[PDB]
């Protein structure tokens, strides 16, 4: 997992975040913050 500080309630929210931050959308909302894979 890659850490982010981006808050979230649902995993789909994390897809654009992870795409911007790490180059792929694969990501889940984990304990209220995005994690990217």
Q: What are phi and psi of 16, to 5 degrees?
A: -65, -30
Is domain 2-36 given the CATH code 3.30.30.10 in the classification?
A: yes
Residue pair 34/27 in contact by the 8 Å Cβ criterion: yes
**What is the resolution in angstroms?**
1.9
The two beta strands, 33-36 and 2-7, are: antiparallel
Q: What are phi and psi of 12, to 5 degrees?
A: -55, -35
Residue ranges per domain, the chain?
A: 2-36
Q: How was this structure determined?
A: X-ray
Which residues in the chain precede a discontinuity of more than 2.5 Å between C and N? none
């Amino acid at each position: 997992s890659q850490f982010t500080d981006v808050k979230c309630t649902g995993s789909k929210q994390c897809w654009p975040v992870c795409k911007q931050m790490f180059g792929k959308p694969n990501g889940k909302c984990m304990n209220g913050k995005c994690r990217c894979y």
